[PDB]
Amino acid sequence: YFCDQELQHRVESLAAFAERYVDKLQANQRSRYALLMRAFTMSAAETARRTREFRSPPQEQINMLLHFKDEADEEDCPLPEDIRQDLQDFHQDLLAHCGIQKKPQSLQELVSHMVVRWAQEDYVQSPELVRAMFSLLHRQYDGLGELLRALPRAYTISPSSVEDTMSLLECLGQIRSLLIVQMGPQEENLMIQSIGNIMNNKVFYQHPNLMRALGMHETVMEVMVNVLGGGIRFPKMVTSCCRFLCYFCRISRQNQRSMFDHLSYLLENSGIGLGMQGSTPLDVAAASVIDNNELALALQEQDLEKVVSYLAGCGLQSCPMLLAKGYPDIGWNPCGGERYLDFLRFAVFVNGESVEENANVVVRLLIRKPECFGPALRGEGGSGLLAAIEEAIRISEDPARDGPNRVHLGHAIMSFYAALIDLLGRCAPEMHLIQAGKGEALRIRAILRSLVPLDDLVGIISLPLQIPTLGKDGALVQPKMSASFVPDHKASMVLFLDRVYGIENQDFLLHVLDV
Amino acid sequence: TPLYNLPTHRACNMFLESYKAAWILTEDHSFEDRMIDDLSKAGEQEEEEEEVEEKKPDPLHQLVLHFSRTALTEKSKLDEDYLYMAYADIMAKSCHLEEGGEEEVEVSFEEKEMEKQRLLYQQSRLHTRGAAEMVLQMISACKGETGAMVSSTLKLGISILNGGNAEVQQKMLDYLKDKKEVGFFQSIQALMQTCSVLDLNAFERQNKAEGLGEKVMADDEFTQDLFRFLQLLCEGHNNDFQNYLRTQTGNTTTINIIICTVDYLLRLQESISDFYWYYSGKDVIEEQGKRNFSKAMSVAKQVFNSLTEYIQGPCT
Amino acid sequence: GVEIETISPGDGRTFPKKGQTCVVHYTGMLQNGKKFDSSRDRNKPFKFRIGKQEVIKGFEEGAAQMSLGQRAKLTCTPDVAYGATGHPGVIPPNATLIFDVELLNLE
Amino acid sequence: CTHARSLWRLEPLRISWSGSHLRWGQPLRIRHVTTGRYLALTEDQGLVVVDACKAHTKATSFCFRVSKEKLEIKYGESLCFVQHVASGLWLTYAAPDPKALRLGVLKKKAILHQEGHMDDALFLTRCQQEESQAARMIHSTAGLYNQFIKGLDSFSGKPRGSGPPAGPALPIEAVILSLQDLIGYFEPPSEELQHEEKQSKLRSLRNRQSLFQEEGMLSLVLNCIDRLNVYTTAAHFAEYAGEEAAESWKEIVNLLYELLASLIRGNRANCALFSTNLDWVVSKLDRLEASSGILEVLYCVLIESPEVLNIIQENHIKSIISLLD
Amino acid sequence: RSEGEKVRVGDDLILVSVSSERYLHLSTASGELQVDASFMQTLWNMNP
Amino acid sequence: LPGPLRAGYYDLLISIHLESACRSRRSMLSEYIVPLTPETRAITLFPPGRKGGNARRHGLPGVGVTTSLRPPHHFSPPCFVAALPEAPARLS
Known part of the structure; x- marks a missing residue:
């Protein structure tokens, strides 16, 4: 306890000196700004000065300013000699306090002689006692290293945010206290309230670095681990954790990287039953991977294999809780695979540009497992996409097959095929690469053309749509949404048409216009 | 962008990070040798002990015995232990000072001999207390799982066995033959199987990501340390240990490290051939390719040296 | 309801009314002579307003019936006490409570 | 591969020089160590394991041929082919069963076919003496306790009266001696031992307990306890099993509970097997005999597994409190 | 059989x-029996 | 009092009056967050010698001013006469 108090005193003194030194360096930089702005006789020298150590990235500026530790860079650093000497004196004082350089004259020496004497007197038979004394001796001998390890946890805040900071700490304390207790209804409600308060706190999204230092994402991850291991027994717990994690991803980019570091677990636990939840670990992974080029490029093919395997399983067997509710069985599960196809679309397409490596891996996995297409586009079934779409139209039309409606299998068929077509469309190679003549790009485009014929695409594009009409007197009759064909499907298919096949002849253009 | 326009607290945090990166980290302080020397001394217990010179173990002996107890404790998987990592680093540095020495310089024969004697003494201060068995127990308990624990254990073993210490080699061989275990060699084989080779897909991804802004050969230090450890085990032309690595008589199952080493070298050769095929078209090799080639060639150099040691001394 | 037995005499004129503060050291015990409450152990007077219904109703009527400086016994039936939904681990599902309370420092 | 079920005993037909080296093509007999049955080929069921009485040289005799051609053996690295004598048939896996594949089971029903398959030569590996001894005690104990259970079921429901049961007498002495030997065999290692040797002995005890658990001695002991617990007292036991058999009832009950506690002690999987046996232990907590034993069994189960504690219910807690009451 | 191992006579090869x-x-x-390049696979015994 | 009973009563007191607060404070001791305050800037690594001329004096541990943010403890006095009433967690 006393050693911990000493460490806390050291880090607080360091923070106070950091405040004072930051104030002095800001004043000096403003003074130098004024001096250089007034004296700009040398154009080239002024330009070079403005480029380096002048209105630059702040971290780069402070890193270059604090470089006077080296003798060569001491002259390069424009900091005043008094400022440099102040920093050197503080560094020397920190070394002296840490002990870097016979009656015990300090706690460090006293504890060191204590541990040595106790070890020498006898043969200690208590493993816990032995571990305690040797850990204490290690802490006494390693003073500067302990402070070095402690610095990442240190953080500095403004005086006006102390109240909200205390409230956030209290909520986090409730969250941590609920960990050791076995999960129940009351504990569940308390975690929901705590997560809600954390999300509503303004400091939470204003200091993502401080949140990451506190490691709250790890704590909510452990809560999610516990609830997922339990089952869903606590679907409110799972949904709240997923929403909090998605918001944490959306806050910033380094948060997204920290969430991406745990990608494998989320995809492994992403299942059909767990994925039918409103907020899922699959959604968390999608948020952690979406709209980040380097994160998409760092994707391992094992995760893609796992999600493709889940898609293949969903396309193989029917939906368990759907047939339990009593909806007619199609022999396969489109709604489960819709989520997987969305995840693959996010993985492949970023910032409106197709990732070549990810697209190639995905298309090779899909052609390797030909059971991911269901009845239509099947190696064995060979069912035309247009025929399948019209069959689903009539299935949605007749309540005998549509009814077990909360879930419409007729609309699920359309959604699954639209997602598949959209994914294959965004997996298409770029036009500049095609013009350059890359063999892999040409092969991928040829494979996509082979899988999806153009005639079937233009046929479904030309398929009719129901138009609202006030057939009843004074009542405006509309098509039943989430149960009938919608223009989003046509949008995805025409995205495929533009990406893969495209428009090349006016004749074809005019035709497509008329159809 | 100016610091004065930047808010005070954010500037303070950035200054904390800058000071951490620039001053505290770069500062160097040596305490391993002093602390090991202080721990080695028994004090007055041996002064008052008359029947036995030292019946009660000295503090360093108690520490290594505690770590050996933790290693021998039946655990399904080895867990992270910062205390063990730090302590192993301390002892490794203390015994590696003399090996590291702590321009066509003509070192005298006497100077070389005293340096070797100092290294032997510093290695004795640890292997006369249980480190030679602690390293084996830790490697067996790793269960062929890569991590900082096995990395620290391998570094400690290399530091102990540096220079081909016949005494420590005999101690490890006697312990292995007495306990008659397969976990040590199973873990060693698993660690070899879980090594790394050059990856062209990773290289292309890294180049593209860096352009639009090393992973193509990681664990290079780990694999070089593993093969250096094997070479030290066979060092000195000890036919007993060489034959033991080939076949482990007495044990129910034997693992052929010699063949395993050869197998790995092969995989590395295939990776280097793939890299050559990739860079054969281009006129000039870029800096990233040069770095990758240097890494792979250094690893291959280690593997060759290990194989030489296995057979150097006539071993039919 | 609540049965009021006098133990020692008090002022007899200054009766508490709605909206005042009463501090009293009390000792709670079960029907079978088992003690469970004592403000003397805590060495602090128990404080309560009259009218906010934070305390059990029988205790409120017993305190309001007595004057300042009077020590009296209160017999509370489970109807006015916790009753069936008693304190888990403290009070059984059906028990009458006996309380010896002395009123001082009315506010 | 670690269970004792995979254990087989190869013994030459020649009684003389039984311990001699196996010769390529020398006729020999294959016997199952645990079940005690001999491998043989029959007309109606193909090849099966049969009793010792049904075992004959016409069916139980096999040979380790060098190769498939119709025109000494190292223990390992052997390409021996198991050919039944007086026949050209060989041991080989049946045609891949799609049903078995669906089941995902590796139960390749072994078939004797004159054509065989490419994967017919098989490796031989000797087990440890500990495993061999454990399998032998499993066989003997299973036989003895099956005999005891049959004896107990013989007189169930029929009053004995004056004349003792006309059936075979119960092997009370053998059962008691076997229980004592098993308790001594499963006794935990002493804590005074060094840490390393103590850990090794704990591992030995754990694997031994696992072997007996997978062979099912725990279920056999539970069945014996269920059979014995029908009679309330020693006099009630004597009213059916005989006065001479009465005196050992309490001792056998206590030994059975102690043996069950020894089996489950220190094995988390064995304790977890009693996840649905919480009623079985709680409803017997109030038994006058072996009350300490059943309490110790419950203590071990609760301190070893968390799930048996998570299932604990209000009636269970009330029964535990009534134990004190 | 594994990638990198030398193929031998009387062995099944997957041709893509x-x-x-x-x-x-x-x-x-x-x-x-029609031989065609499809997404389903079939083993091939490569005999000289 | 016998030693086992003395230890039992001490541990019972610690469990029923300090366990939750001690656990919460121990959990919060891991992180160091400090506000920009005059009390913060008043902290000195080496306190000046009171006598004078004394430098590099190490302050006594646990005596210096600490401005790191630690949430305060919360307790609820025991009460068994109040009427017995989603459900907030009870306090120590």
Whole structure:
């Protein structure tokens, strides 16, 4: 306890000196700004000065300013000699306090002689006692290293945010206290309230670095681990954790990287039953991977294999809780695979540009497992996409097959095929690469053309749509949404048409216009 | 962008990070040798002990015995232990000072001999207390799982066995033959199987990501340390240990490290051939390719040296 | 309801009314002579307003019936006490409570 | 591969020089160590394991041929082919069963076919003496306790009266001696031992307990306890099993509970097997005999597994409190 | 058999087209053995 | 009092009056967050010698001013006469 108090005193003194030194360096930089702005006789020298150590990235500026530790860079650093000497004196004082350089004259020496004497007197038979004394001796001998390890946890805040900071700490304390207790209804409600308060706190999204230092994402991850291991027994717990994690991803980019570091677990636990939840670990992974080029490029093919395997399983067997509710069985599960196809679309397409490596891996996995297409586009079934779409139209039309409606299998068929077509469309190679003549790009485009014929695409594009009409007197009759064909499907298919096949002849253009 | 326009607290945090990166980290302080020397001394217990010179173990002996107890404790998987990592680093540095020495310089024969004697003494201060068995127990308990624990254990073993210490080699061989275990060699084989080779897909991804802004050969230090450890085990032309690595008589199952080493070298050769095929078209090799080639060639150099040691001394 | 037995005499004129503060050291015990409450152990007077219904109703009527400086016994039936939904681990599902309370420092 | 079920005993037909080296093509007999049955080929069921009485040289005799051609053996690295004598048939896996594949089971029903398959030569590996001894005690104990259970079921429901049961007498002495030997065999290692040797002995005890658990001695002991617990007292036991058999009832009950506690002690999987046996232990907590034993069994189960504690219910807690009451 | 191992006589090899990335498959649904490059795979015994 | 009973009563007191607060404070001791305050800037690594001329004096541990943010403890006095009433967690 006393050693911990000493460490806390050291880090607080360091923070106070950091405040004072930051104030002095800001004043000096403003003074130098004024001096250089007034004296700009040398154009080239002024330009070079403005480029380096002048209105630059702040971290780069402070890193270059604090470089006077080296003798060569001491002259390069424009900091005043008094400022440099102040920093050197503080560094020397920190070394002296840490002990870097016979009656015990300090706690460090006293504890060191204590541990040595106790070890020498006898043969200690208590493993816990032995571990305690040797850990204490290690802490006494390693003073500067302990402070070095402690610095990442240190953080500095403004005086006006102390109240909200205390409230956030209290909520986090409730969250941590609920960990050791076995999960129940009351504990569940308390975690929901705590997560809600954390999300509503303004400091939470204003200091993502401080949140990451506190490691709250790890704590909510452990809560999610516990609830997922339990089952869903606590679907409110799972949904709240997923929403909090998605918001944490959306806050910033380094948060997204920290969430991406745990990608494998989320995809492994992403299942059909767990994925039918409103907020899922699959959604968390999608948020952690979406709209980040380097994160998409760092994707391992094992995760893609796992999600493709889940898609293949969903396309193989029917939906368990759907047939339990009593909806007619199609022999396969489109709604489960819709989520997987969305995840693959996010993985492949970023910032409106197709990732070549990810697209190639995905298309090779899909052609390797030909059971991911269901009845239509099947190696064995060979069912035309247009025929399948019209069959689903009539299935949605007749309540005998549509009814077990909360879930419409007729609309699920359309959604699954639209997602598949959209994914294959965004997996298409770029036009500049095609013009350059890359063999892999040409092969991928040829494979996509082979899988999806153009005639079937233009046929479904030309398929009719129901138009609202006030057939009843004074009542405006509309098509039943989430149960009938919608223009989003046509949008995805025409995205495929533009990406893969495209428009090349006016004749074809005019035709497509008329159809 | 100016610091004065930047808010005070954010500037303070950035200054904390800058000071951490620039001053505290770069500062160097040596305490391993002093602390090991202080721990080695028994004090007055041996002064008052008359029947036995030292019946009660000295503090360093108690520490290594505690770590050996933790290693021998039946655990399904080895867990992270910062205390063990730090302590192993301390002892490794203390015994590696003399090996590291702590321009066509003509070192005298006497100077070389005293340096070797100092290294032997510093290695004795640890292997006369249980480190030679602690390293084996830790490697067996790793269960062929890569991590900082096995990395620290391998570094400690290399530091102990540096220079081909016949005494420590005999101690490890006697312990292995007495306990008659397969976990040590199973873990060693698993660690070899879980090594790394050059990856062209990773290289292309890294180049593209860096352009639009090393992973193509990681664990290079780990694999070089593993093969250096094997070479030290066979060092000195000890036919007993060489034959033991080939076949482990007495044990129910034997693992052929010699063949395993050869197998790995092969995989590395295939990776280097793939890299050559990739860079054969281009006129000039870029800096990233040069770095990758240097890494792979250094690893291959280690593997060759290990194989030489296995057979150097006539071993039919 | 609540049965009021006098133990020692008090002022007899200054009766508490709605909206005042009463501090009293009390000792709670079960029907079978088992003690469970004592403000003397805590060495602090128990404080309560009259009218906010934070305390059990029988205790409120017993305190309001007595004057300042009077020590009296209160017999509370489970109807006015916790009753069936008693304190888990403290009070059984059906028990009458006996309380010896002395009123001082009315506010 | 670690269970004792995979254990087989190869013994030459020649009684003389039984311990001699196996010769390529020398006729020999294959016997199952645990079940005690001999491998043989029959007309109606193909090849099966049969009793010792049904075992004959016409069916139980096999040979380790060098190769498939119709025109000494190292223990390992052997390409021996198991050919039944007086026949050209060989041991080989049946045609891949799609049903078995669906089941995902590796139960390749072994078939004797004159054509065989490419994967017919098989490796031989000797087990440890500990495993061999454990399998032998499993066989003997299973036989003895099956005999005891049959004896107990013989007189169930029929009053004995004056004349003792006309059936075979119960092997009370053998059962008691076997229980004592098993308790001594499963006794935990002493804590005074060094840490390393103590850990090794704990591992030995754990694997031994696992072997007996997978062979099912725990279920056999539970069945014996269920059979014995029908009679309330020693006099009630004597009213059916005989006065001479009465005196050992309490001792056998206590030994059975102690043996069950020894089996489950220190094995988390064995304790977890009693996840649905919480009623079985709680409803017997109030038994006058072996009350300490059943309490110790419950203590071990609760301190070893968390799930048996998570299932604990209000009636269970009330029964535990009534134990004190 | 594993990638990198030298193939030998009397061994099954999976043949995949370099361009179309399809296996040499023996379709039998038509009633006659037809060799075609499809996404399903079939083993090949490569004998000299 | 016998030693086992003395230890039992001490541990019972610690469990029923300090366990939750001690656990919460121990959990919060891991992180160091400090506000920009005059009390913060008043902290000195080496306190000046009171006598004078004394430098590099190490302050006594646990005596210096600490401005790191630690949430305060919360307790609820025991009460068994109040009427017995989603459900907030009870306090120590």
